[PDB]
């Protein structure tokens with residue numbers, strides 16, 4: 249398992265790419281197989297593969313302006329090649345103001361330079377309203393692109 | 397900062413006491429001024445202090461029958477005297493079946509033997525229904541006890 253400071257460097261580049269709020273910046277630290285699973289398991293939100301998130305994040309970021317990320321807690325388990333962060337976010341969306349908070353579990357690859365698995369719990373009351381707004385927005389971008 | 401194995405021992409006792417589901421077993425790792433904070437911050441849930449916890453847990457535990465804890469993930473940051481765990485639970489309650497899942501952030505005291513701060517995010521759809529039900533059930537116990 250890679251040295252702490254290398255994993256920690258991956259964590260920071262993930263958070264900074266998140267704050268930078270472009271697809272390429274944020275997805276730079278995700279491996280090709282990195283899955284994102286929404287917790288709790290009981291909410292039955294299907295795990296999301298990399299083709300899914302590569303298609304979502306451009307659309308998602310385009311409808312969140314003044315995105316500000318705030319990191320409250322980094323728990324680094326260098327021996328286990330693992331981490332957990334707590335973050336909060338705000339943005340303006342086509343649907344009104346957006347706020348969220350995130351408990352995020354990360355796993356790194358052997359080299360400690362990519363994130364390989366993501367599991368996350370968020371503000372489910374924010375998401376109950378926003379996920380369907382986002383899904384219909386995504387479908388509208390899809391249809392609009394296929395036409396042209 | 398205490399050695400990693402001593403901090404890990406408190407984690408293991410915390411989860412084992414939780415599993416054993418008695419006020420004494422679970423609380424043995426809680427420092428005497430340890431606070432419990434519900435995330436997200438945006439839901440503005442007041443800190444539960446140790447006295448609140450000591451009154452709540454005997455009632456709460458008494459209406460959760462067949463309680464089962466499953467631990468999914470332990471993120472230990474010995475260098476920062478911190479940790480994060482992910483757990484899920486089931487039980488039978490007088491309000492029907494119960495399921496919950498917890499992303500818990502733990503801080504230890506200097507000795508690494510007590511837990512000093514708890515911040516957790518849970519299944520907010522469980523808690524939306526359960527929390528008022530437990531609050532009314534707790535008031536009823538306090539009333540029934542007073543008049544004896």
Ligand SMILES: COC(=O)c1cc(C)cc(O)c1C(=O)c1c(O)cccc1O
Pocket residue numbers: 304305308337348350352366368370379382
């Ligand atoms: C800020 O947005 C992110 O890129 C994001 C990133 C991470 C690591 C977890 C998330 O929960 C989100 C998210 O907020 C989100 C969403 O709000 C709607 C659909 C999918 C998502 O991933």
Ligand SMILES: COC(=O)c1cc(C)cc(O)c1C(=O)c1c(O)cccc1O
Pocket residue numbers: 452453456485496498500516518526527530
């Ligand atoms: C299983 O119960 C616990 O002792 C418990 C314990 C921890 C570490 C987090 C919790 O969220 C709970 C809880 O589930 C709970 C509840 O369901 C209602 C009121 C207070 C609580 O702490």
